Amino acid sequence: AVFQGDFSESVPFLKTPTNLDGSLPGDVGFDPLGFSEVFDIRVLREAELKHGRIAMLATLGYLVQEAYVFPFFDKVPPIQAHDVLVKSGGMSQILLWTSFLEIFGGIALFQTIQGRRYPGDFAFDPLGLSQGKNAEKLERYQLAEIKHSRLAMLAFSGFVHQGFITKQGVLEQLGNFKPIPGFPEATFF
Amino acid sequence: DRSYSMPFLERPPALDGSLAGDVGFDPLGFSNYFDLKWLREAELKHGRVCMLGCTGFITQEKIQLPLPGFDNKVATEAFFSVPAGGLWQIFFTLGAIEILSNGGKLAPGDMFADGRAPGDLGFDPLNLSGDDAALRRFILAELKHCRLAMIGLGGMLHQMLITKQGPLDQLANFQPIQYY
Amino acid sequence: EALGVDDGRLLVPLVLIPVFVALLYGNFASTQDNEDFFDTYDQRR
Amino acid sequence: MFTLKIVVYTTVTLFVSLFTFGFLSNDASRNPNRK
Amino acid sequence: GLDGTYVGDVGFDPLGFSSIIDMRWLREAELKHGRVCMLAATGMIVQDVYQFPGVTKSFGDAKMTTLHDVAVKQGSMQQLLVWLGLLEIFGFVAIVQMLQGSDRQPGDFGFDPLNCAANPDTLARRQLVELKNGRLAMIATAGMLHHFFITGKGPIQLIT
Amino acid sequence: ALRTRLGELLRPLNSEYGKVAPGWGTTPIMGFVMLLFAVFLLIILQIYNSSLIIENVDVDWASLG
Amino acid sequence: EAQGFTAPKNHFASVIGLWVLFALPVWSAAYKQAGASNPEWFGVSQVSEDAPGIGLLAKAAPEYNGPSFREGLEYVFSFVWKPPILIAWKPRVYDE
Numbered sequence: 001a002v003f004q005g006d007f008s009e010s011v012p013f014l015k016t017p018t019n020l021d022g023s024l025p026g027d028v029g030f031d032p033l034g035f036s037e038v039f040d041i042r043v044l045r046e047a048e049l050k051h052g053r054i055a056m057l058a059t060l061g062y063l064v065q066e067a068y069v070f071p072f073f074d075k076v077p078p079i080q081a082h083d084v085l086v087k088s089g090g091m092s093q094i095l096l097w098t099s100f101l102e103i104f105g106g107i108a109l110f111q112t113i114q115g116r117r118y119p120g121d122f123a124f125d126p127l128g129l130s131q132g133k134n135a136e137k138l139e140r141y142q143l144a145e146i147k148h149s150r151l152a153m154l155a156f157s158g159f160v161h162q163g164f165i166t167k168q169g170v171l172e173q174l175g176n177f178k179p180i181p182g183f184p185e186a187t188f189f
Numbered sequence: 190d191r192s193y194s195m196p197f198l199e200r201p202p203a204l205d206g207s208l209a210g211d212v213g214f215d216p217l218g219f220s221n222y223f224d225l226k227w228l229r230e231a232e233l234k235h236g237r238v239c240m241l242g243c244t245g246f247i248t249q250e251k252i253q254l255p256l257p258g259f260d261n262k263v264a265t266e267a268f269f270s271v272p273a274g275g276l277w278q279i280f281f282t283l284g285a286i287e288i289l290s291n292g293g294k295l296a297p298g299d300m301f302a303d304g305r306a307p308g309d310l311g312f313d314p315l316n317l318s319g320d321d322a323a324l325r326r327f328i329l330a331e332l333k334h335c336r337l338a339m340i341g342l343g344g345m346l347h348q349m350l351i352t353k354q355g356p357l358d359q360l361a362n363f364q365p366i367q368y369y
Numbered sequence: 370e371a372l373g374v375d376d377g378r379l380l381v382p383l384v385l386i387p388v389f390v391a392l393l394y395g396n397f398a399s400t401q402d403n404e405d406f407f408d409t410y411d412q413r414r
Numbered sequence: 415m416f417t418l419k420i421v422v423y424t425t426v427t428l429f430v431s432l433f434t435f436g437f438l439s440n441d442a443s444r445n446p447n448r449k
Numbered sequence: 450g451l452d453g454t455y456v457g458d459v460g461f462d463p464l465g466f467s468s469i470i471d472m473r474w475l476r477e478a479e480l481k482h483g484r485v486c487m488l489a490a491t492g493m494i495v496q497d498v499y500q501f502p503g504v505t506k507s508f509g510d511a512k513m514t515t516l517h518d519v520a521v522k523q524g525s526m527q528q529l530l531v532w533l534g535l536l537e538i539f540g541f542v543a544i545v546q547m548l549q550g551s552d553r554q555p556g557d558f559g560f561d562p563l564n565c566a567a568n569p570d571t572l573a574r575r576q577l578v579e580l581k582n583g584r585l586a587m588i589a590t591a592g593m594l595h596h597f598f599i600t601g602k603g604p605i606q607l608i609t
Numbered sequence: 610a611l612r613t614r615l616g617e618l619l620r621p622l623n624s625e626y627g628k629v630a631p632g633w634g635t636t637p638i639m640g641f642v643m644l645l646f647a648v649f650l651l652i653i654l655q656i657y658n659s660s661l662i663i664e665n666v667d668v669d670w671a672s673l674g
Numbered sequence: 675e676a677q678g679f680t681a682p683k684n685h686f687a688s689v690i691g692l693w694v695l696f697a698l699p700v701w702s703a704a705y706k707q708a709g710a711s712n713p714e715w716f717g718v719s720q721v722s723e724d725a726p727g728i729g730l731l732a733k734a735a736p737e738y739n740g741p742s743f744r745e746g747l748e749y750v751f752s753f754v755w756k757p758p759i760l761i762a763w764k765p766r767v768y769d770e
């Protein structure tokens with residue numbers, strides 16, 4: 001805001017979103033269309049983390065699935081694997097167990113709505129990372145988790161879409177990089 | 190003393206500044222012999238029906254659902270192609286929205302019996318009608334869009350019936366009426 | 370075959386007329402006391 | 415044949431709907447002992 | 450409806466647009482059209498003089514509007530709509546925040562990377578320049594395009 | 610006397626019983642129109658009677674075709 | 675390729691269906707907790723309030739203590755069987 005004004009850190013032009021305060025981790029203040037105003041921030045935070053935690057595993061997997069396949073499973077481009085496993089019924093097994101865990105999760109969301117639990121804490125810290133000795137680290141880690149999650153969700157999105165246009169696997173695209181098919185060759189007119 | 194819209198005529202008595210979209214255009218004076226709340230609910234409902242409909246004629250031509258028979262670019266032609274049962278299922282779902290929205294008070298005498306300023310079926314998911322000044326000006330917009338859409342849909346329907354072409358396509362490759 | 374409807378147009382009278390008359394009945398029904406009565410029949414009308 | 419069929423269907427549906435919604439309009443209350 | 454405070458006010462509103470529409474909107478609009486037109490005029494002139502490295506082969510000689518009809522097929526235009534649209538959604542938030550009471554003055558997005566407006570006085574002179582160049586640019590762009598429609602010629606070519 | 614919607618609708622049409630214009634009113638106009646009607650009747654009668662033969666007016670069955 | 679309760683697709687649909695059911699409790703509660711209800715959250719329009727066709731009072735509801743609906747239909751019918759076109763050409767004692 002070249003003219004002086006009170007304003008949000010991430011975007012100079014817009015005012016700091018109301019009810020958006022530094023307290024949730026990773027708050028650069030960017031909620032340009034308030035969603036936080038329309039729905040509670042804690043319910044939204046639970047979503048950012050859940051999507052992210054799902055995404056972070058997915059980014060690793062799409063890359064790992066390209067390089068390696070468990071021997072019992074066939075090696076196919078990952079998007080194809082979902083079709084193979086869905087016929088196999090492997091995906092139903094992932095769906096059933098993930099749903100069971102989610103039902104416990106849905107109860108915890110209801111508690112998050114009624115005070116009680118902080119968004120996204122399932123108290124899953126089997127290892128001692130951020131243990132009471134390491135309790136200082138939790139604030140820092142929280143920031144990393146949102147940041148890794150925000151990035152992963154963008155990255156997976158990217159890997160899958162880029163892969164559809166290129167028809168080229170993400171590791172392969174890196175090492176051999178080509179324009180979307182036909183562009184060097186094609187003339188629009 | 191004089192209508193704003195039609196300077197020669199007199200301001201329709203019933204119309205005062207209070208209803209929105211009031212420039213005094215009730216030359217035939219329907220206002221004198223019917224309830225403005227009934228009339229407004231209709232001005233709005235026909236528009237809201239033809240804001241969805243007009244957008245519908247344009248969208249259908251560009252993009253059509255994957256299911257079979259949802260493939261006719263011309264809206265008028267599509268009505269026949271789509272399965273008849275589906276069209277009735279839409280009828281009924283809309284019919285339920287009518288009864289639930291109006292709370293079962295669905296007639297000229299009873300619809301407005303409890304509150305219900307005309308057109309307040311309660312759909313304001315993102316509260317935007319909290320400022321009054323804002324509400325008074327948004328309400329003019331809805332009516333001005335409703336009134337344009339009514340005229341637009343009629344034009345698109347009639348022009349398609351002659352051309353057997355969707356609105357955007359007819360403008361491209363326009364041909365005089367004699368050709369059709 | 371269902372309801373002898375071989376032409377879709379037959380469904381228009383079959384649905385619009387019962388709805389329209391229901392609309393007339395809706396006004397009778399809304400002008401009534403629809404609270405419960407604990408009796409053999411409702412004398413409120 | 416279709417026009418006669420649609421006219422007959424319209425008439426029958428109208429009369430049956432009138433009968434059905436008339437007997438739904440608290441017909442038991444239409445007795446001389448009702449207060 | 451027209452008062453001295455807005456920069457560039459020579460008092461010229463014959464058709465009385467100011468009376469019906471908030472000045473803050475009208476101004477944000479005049480600058481936004483101007484900022485776009487300035488870039489458009491520059492581009493149309495640049496395009497005739499130079500083209501990016503692989504561009505000529507894919508598009509050939511099409512220029513001005515014709516290039517757009519060819520560009521859309523490349524999808525160069527789409528990327529431009531999607532990215533420009535993403536900036537615009539923030540811009541819609543900005544107009545809304547400004548129309549709601551807010552600090553931002555019309556046309557201020559906070560882009561001053563080189564700190565050129567740090568002096569308060571210099572900023573005012575620059576603001577007048579920006580409306581005036583922009584008002585000129587819009588007139589020019591329209592002219593270049595109309596010239597194109599009629600002559601089928603790019604503006605530098607028309608000069609040639 | 611029963612009052613009905615159609616009765617009230619048509620009542621002004623049957624309201625001015627015995628209302629008359631003063632004096633002779635439009636009597637000369639009526640007489641002039643009656644004179645014109647008499648002349649017209651004489652013309653058509655003499656055409657049918659064949660005592661009046663306008664050109665292209667063949668009072669005959671053969672004029673049918 | 676099993677079908678129905680054992681079909682893979684019905685199950686994916688079932689999870690989508692469970693989300694639709696849980697949406698109303700989870701997000702209505704979220705909307706109930708803080709939805710809108712902000713002095714700072716209000717709609718805005720560029721058009722001036724003096725612009726013609728803007729109502730003095732929002733959601734206006736006229737009392738309309740006037741002719742019953744049926745009489746109005748009659749007025750609308752009198753449009754087509756009794757318009758005032760020929761009254762303008764109206765012409766300008768009682769025998770005893």
Ligand code: CLA
Pocket residue numbers: 085088089090091092093094095097098
């Ligand atoms: C722990 C409980 C459990 C059990 C009994 C099963 C059972 C099954 N799963 Mg698995 N699964 C589970 C949890 C479980 N799942 C979880 C939590 C996930 C992650 C969300 C998955 C993800 C998954 C996928 C992705 C797939 C399966 C498949 C299968 C089926 C094929 C079995 C197979 O490969 O041959 C027999 C198994 C082997 C030869 C592998 C060696 C197993 C060793 C010998 C047993 C070790 C103990 C065992 C893990 C039990 C753990 C619990 C116990 C300690 C109490 C089978 C019905 C597949 C399927 O649908 O079939 C096509 C498939 O593709 N599952």
Ligand code: CLA
Pocket residue numbers: 227228230231232234235238279280281283284285287288291294295296297388392
């Ligand atoms: C089960 C189905 C169902 C039911 C019960 C209702 C119930 C209702 N609707 Mg309907 N509606 C439905 C489905 C349904 N809706 C669907 C699917 C649509 C299309 C999306 C509509 C579109 C619709 C509109 C547009 C309107 C309603 C209205 C109403 C309300 C008044 C009903 C009434 O008295 O009309 C009984 C039926 C009639 C009076 C016949 C219709 C009148 C004709 C068509 C007018 C013709 C005018 C003419 C062409 C112009 C003259 C031209 C000139 C040259 C002479 C009521 C709550 C009205 C309302 O709320 O009013 C305040 C209203 O304006 N509805």
Ligand code: CLA
Pocket residue numbers: 451452454455456457458459460461462464465466467468472475476478479482584585587588
């Ligand atoms: C679109 C560009 C645009 C816009 C939004 C404005 C807006 C404004 N100008 Mg600027 N101006 C412009 C172009 C523009 N001007 C150009 C090209 C010139 C040079 C000729 C000027 C020269 C100028 C001077 C010298 C002054 C202004 C002033 C003003 C302010 C008050 C004037 C007013 O009420 O009319 C608003 C203007 C319009 C509504 C533009 C109308 C253009 C045509 C007639 C519209 C025709 C309809 C259109 C084609 C429909 C399609 C629209 C569709 C694309 C959406 C206002 C902020 C005054 C000021 O600073 O006050 C504070 C002042 O003194 N202007």
Ligand code: KC2
Pocket residue numbers: 271272273274275276278279282
């Ligand atoms: C928004 C309005 C709307 C609602 C609220 C709604 C609700 C339900 C529910 C209740 C939850 C069920 C269980 C259900 C089931 C089916 N719907 Mg659906 N439905 C709606 C709209 C349409 C349209 C427009 C079409 C359609 C269809 C089908 C078919 C296919 C039949 C077949 O397989 O051929 C089946 C089984 C198509 C059709 O019937 O074509 C013959 C078609 O065009 N529906 N529908």
Ligand code: KC2
Pocket residue numbers: 183184185501502503504506507508523525
């Ligand atoms: C960032 C500066 C820059 C911009 C903004 C830009 C825009 C466009 C557009 C936009 C409308 C099109 C359509 C287009 C097309 C092609 N570009 Mg180009 N391009 C730019 C830079 C480079 C470089 C550095 C190279 C290059 C090339 C090609 C080839 C190759 C195959 C061919 O020649 O057939 C094709 C088709 C390579 C080359 O071989 O150039 C002879 C190469 O080294 N470009 N380019």
Ligand SMILES: CC1=C(C#C/C(C)=C/C=C/C(C)=C/C=C/C=C(C)/C=C/C=C(\C)C#CC2=C(C)C[C@@H](O)CC2(C)C)C(C)(C)C[C@H](O)C1
Pocket residue numbers: 030031032033034035051052054055057058059061062065078079081082153154156157
């Ligand atoms: C914040 C903010 C804003 C914003 C914003 C944005 C930009 C929001 C963007 C959000 C995004 C992009 C969220 C993406 C989530 C992606 C996920 C969860 C991926 C899941 C993948 C899975 C389950 C998988 C998989 C797979 C694996 C792993 C491998 C395969 O073999 C199999 C399979 C395919 C199944 C804006 C201004 C708009 C508004 C606002 O005022 C505030």
Ligand SMILES: CC1=C(C#C/C(C)=C/C=C/C(C)=C/C=C/C=C(C)/C=C/C=C(\C)C#CC2=C(C)C[C@@H](O)CC2(C)C)C(C)(C)C[C@H](O)C1
Pocket residue numbers: 026028146147148150151154165523524525527528531
């Ligand atoms: C924000 C932030 C941080 C960050 C960050 C980062 C690093 C964000 C990075 C974001 C990026 C790179 C987003 C990329 C978007 C690319 C898009 C949408 C492309 C769309 C393509 C289209 C529409 C197309 C097309 C088409 C064309 C052209 C023509 C057609 O023939 C073909 C085709 C279909 C392909 C982090 C987490 C570090 C921390 C922090 O807490 C906040």
